[PDB]
Paper text:
Elevated glucagon levels and increased hepatic glucagon receptor (GCGR) signaling contribute to hyperglycemia in type 2 diabetes. We have identified a monoclonal antibody that inhibits GCGR, a class B G-protein coupled receptor (GPCR), through a unique allosteric mechanism. Receptor inhibition is mediated by the binding of this antibody to two distinct sites that lie outside of the glucagon binding cleft. One site consists of a patch of residues that are surface-exposed on the face of the extracellular domain (ECD) opposite the ligand-binding cleft, whereas the second binding site consists of residues in the αA helix of the ECD.
Despite considerable effort, we have been unable to obtain diffracting crystals of the GCGR ECD in complex with mAb7. Using the structures of the mAb7.v16 (S28T, S54T) Fab, and of the WT and G40S ECDs, we explored the mechanism of GCGR antagonism by mAb7 by attempting to dock the Fab onto the surface of the ECD. Using HADDOCK software, we performed in silico docking studies with the G40S GCGR and mAb7 structures using the GCGR and mAb7 mutagenesis data as restraint inputs. These analyses revealed that the only reasonable orientation in which mAb7 could readily bind the ECD while being consistent with the mutagenesis data is one in which the CDRs of mAb7 largely straddled the αA helix of GCGR similar to a saddle. In this model, the ligand-binding cleft of the GCGR ECD is not occluded by mAb7 (purple schematic), indicating that inhibition of glucagon binding is unlikely through steric clashes between mAb7 and glucagon. The docking model predicts that residue 54 on CDR H2 of mAb7 makes contact with the face of the GCGR ECD opposite the ligand-binding cleft. In this model, an asparagine residue cannot be accommodated on mAb7 without sterically clashing with the GCGR αA helix, whereas a glycine residue could readily pack against this groove.
Author numbering:
A (entry chain L), B (entry chain H): 1 to 217
The structure:
Amino acid sequence: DIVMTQTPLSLPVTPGQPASISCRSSQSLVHSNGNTYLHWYLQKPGQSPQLLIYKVSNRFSGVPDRFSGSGSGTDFTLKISRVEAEDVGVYYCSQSTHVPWTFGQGTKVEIKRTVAAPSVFIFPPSDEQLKSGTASVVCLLNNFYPREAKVQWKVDNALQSGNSQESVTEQDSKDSTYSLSSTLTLSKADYEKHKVYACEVTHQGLSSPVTKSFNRG
Amino acid sequence: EVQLVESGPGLVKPSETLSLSCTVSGDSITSGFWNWIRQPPGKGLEWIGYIGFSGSTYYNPSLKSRVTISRDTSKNQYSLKLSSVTAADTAVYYCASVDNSAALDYWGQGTLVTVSSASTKGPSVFPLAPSSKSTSGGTAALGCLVKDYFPEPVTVSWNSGALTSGVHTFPAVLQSSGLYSLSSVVTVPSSSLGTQTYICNVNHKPSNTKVDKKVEP
């Protein structure tokens, strides 16, 4: 297999600033017909890859002019002259010259926008779920940046551990923020035993750690 | 414009039979080359093979002779079979056309296939009700907790797709039990509660689950 290799693997960039990605192949991609079948794809958050550039330097349909590809033989580059929030996603180089066709590892472009504090919301379990013998408490951190956020659960002021999980969205292609949901799961019996439920959030954009809580009943 | 749509089961047992089919619109598959590509979880892209001009095919050697691609020209469909699957074959599978530049120009939305011996299981859907614990300034948040289903994915919309602004559907988290859980939430004006009705539309195709849950304060 022609090994295609990409650098860097993670690419943070400030909006309006240029970005470059290097792609190497293990062998020349020059076909005997004289063409070089090197292509670039972009996979935006929550969708299929799409063709960005073909045959090294040819821009595909609707691809904004800020994107350009160059290089020859085994040494290729994708340049974005000024990055926009909508350019967020994973960029892959790929070769078509030889079978099997292969892809690079992918380069994750992250947009470095202004710091934004999360809006924090807490949700007790629904009485609908309490029937089932289980209790899920949900903490929501909405529209923040950067991604680094610390959430900790306290029940009657007792630090919790091993009974919660977090999920975080991909960076939004419009406002470049993340959101995060943390769920604390107890049995109905446990949930019924304690009074104050709280999620304490720590983040760069907060003036101090923020806690949202509620009293059972 | 060419459109491609993948279909088939979302769950296969180890060692059992992966079969998917791609239905093409806006072109005839009796010309050109038609492809399968896959992407394992948070993993990058792997070209599987194509079926081309006379029913001829090429398979990536990485699949070790477990793959077969075939077509039904009368229905403008082509299909993938992958034998003796293991967890390594868990992936989103895409069909895609190739053009004259030998790039992959049009892609389907892809379909997730999970290889597991666990059983199919439909989610319970619970409200995340808006309250004073989810209202700050003029903003409120509400949502749906989609709990305890297998395998992925679940789809969530709000008000049959009328409400898209402010919606975040989080990636599913795999619970220790081996079942997935996810939340979808929306931020809305506090002034809209009681005036507007919010319903989350949940779909889990692998279990035939279709649920509409009204979320109220």
